[PDB]
């Protein structure tokens, strides 16, 4: 079929990981220690951000099925 | 001498050949090169093949000789027909030439029932007879020899010792 997305308009995929991460049993050297970008050092991989305390406005939108009134049957409004 | 037939003469000379029966008792003719060389063994084998492939004891052995009738100079020599009677004629014979001029001649030697010594003697006479057209030592005249009977295939005769 003809999907309506366009490669340029869609969000780019993440850049390929550095070759150091592919070597088993080898700790990569990243610039996360100096908390700023530096050429020649591997790009760090960070775990998903987990705010200990939830904030109303700045939190991600909860999934629809998380709502208590969510039901499998499709009702038309 | 055309370069096309010079390639052919190079090709036939490059065909591998080995002496004696290999270690394997049973092997493919494709895998191993020719082995049968002796004239005395070849004549006996043809008589043996007559027993193995039961036919008439009398068979005309039409020998095929891959004669180098070319490459004397840069200009090739022309075919001819030298007639010399064999010491043991079968029951002066012309030496025919190939229609395609592919450097092979088919001339009858003798009957199968003739003894190997007489047939080998006839073979030696044929070798000297064919070389009479170009007896020069500048280039070789014989490349390969294949002795076949009426109901048998040719054998690669070790004709190099019999050239002189």
């Amino acid at each position: 079929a003809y999907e309506w997305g366009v490669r340029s308009t869609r969000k780019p995929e993440p850049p390929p990981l550095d070759r150091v991460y592919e070597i088993p049993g080898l700790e990569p050297i990243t610039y996360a220690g100096k908390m700023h970008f530096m050429p020649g050092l591997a790009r760090p991989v960070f775990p998903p951000w987990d705010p200990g305390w939830t904030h109303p406005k700045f939190r991600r939108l909860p999934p629809l099925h998380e709502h208590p009134l969510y039901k499998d049957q499709a009702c038309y409004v | 001498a055309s370069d096309e037939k010079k390639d052919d003469i190079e090709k036939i000379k490059s065909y591998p050949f080995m002496e004696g029966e290999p270690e394997d008792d049973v092997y493919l003719k494709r895998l191993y090169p020719r082995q049968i060389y002796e004239v005395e063994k070849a004549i006996h084998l043809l008589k043996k093949f007559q027993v193995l492939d039961f036919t008439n004891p009398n068979q005309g052995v039409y020998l095929d000789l891959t004669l180098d009738m070319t490459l004397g100079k840069k200009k090739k020599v022309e075919p001819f027909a030298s007639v010399l009677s064999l010491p043991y004629p079968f029951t002066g014979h012309e030496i025919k030439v190939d229609e395609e001029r592919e450097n092979f001649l088919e001339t009858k030697i003798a009957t199968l029932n003739m003894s190997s010594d007489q047939i080998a003697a006839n073979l030696q006479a044929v070798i000297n007879e064919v070389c009479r057209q170009r007896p020069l030592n500048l280039g070789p005249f014989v490349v390969r020899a294949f002795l076949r009977s009426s109901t048998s295939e040719g054998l690669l005769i070790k004709i190099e010792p019999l050239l002189p």
Partner: protein, 202 residues
């Protein structure tokens, strides 16, 4: 990989010093290219018998492209390093001391493969009485199937054969592998006549 040399000479510097390089020393000329050479072959030791190559533990100078693509990655063969060769050479000594190789030569394995799927036509002429013996059967291999068979290798079913029919022949190579090939005894035909009647017509 290209190989080039400078057109203009470079002045010397013999005290272990880097020589002076000028613009005219950048002018190169291609003297030889490594990809246009007639490439050589790669020698490998086989760790498993191949259908058309040698047998388990054998030296073969296969084409360089083949070795890196299907032999080495799949484990059929290993690099023929000098240290690797003596491991197989010593390995051979153990089996051949007690006659336990049973692997055949490079051609010997191919002989078994061909004889596994083959049929021999034993053409006999009925105008004269014929009796089949191992010497006669080996003849038909050379002409029909192109197989050279030692007279002692063949083991006929010991039943004299005087009429056309279907039988079996036991073929043994190097006294290690025994192959039972089908035997088809049919009336003999001249190949010039036989090929005219069947091959040329169809």
């Amino acid at each position: 990989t290209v190989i080039v040399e400078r057109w203009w000479k470079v002045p010397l510097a013999g005290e272990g010093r880097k020589p002076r390089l000028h613009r005219r020393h950048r002018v190169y000329k291609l003297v030889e290219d490594t990809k246009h050479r007639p490439k050589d072959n790669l020698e490998l030791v086989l760790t498993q018998s191949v259908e058309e190559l040698g047998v388990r533990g054998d030296l073969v100078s296969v084409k360089k492209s083949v070795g890196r693509n299907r032999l080495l990655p799949q484990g059929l063969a290993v690099y023929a390093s000098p240290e690797n060769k003596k491991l197989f050479e010593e390995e051979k000594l153990l089996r051949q001391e007690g006659k336990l190789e049973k692997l055949q030569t490079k051609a010997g394995e191919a002989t078994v493969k061909f004889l596994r799927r083959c049929h021999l036509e034993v053409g006999m002429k009925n105008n004269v009485k014929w009796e089949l013996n191992p010497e006669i059967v080996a003849r038909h291999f050379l002409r029909n199937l192109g197989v050279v068979v030692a007279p002692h290798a063949l083991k006929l079913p010991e039943e004299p054969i005087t009429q056309r029919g279907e039988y079996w022949c036991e073929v043994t190579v190097n006294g290690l592998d025994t192959v039972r090939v089908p035997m088809s005894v049919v009336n003999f035909e001249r190949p010039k006549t036989k090929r005219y009647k069947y091959w040329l017509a169809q």
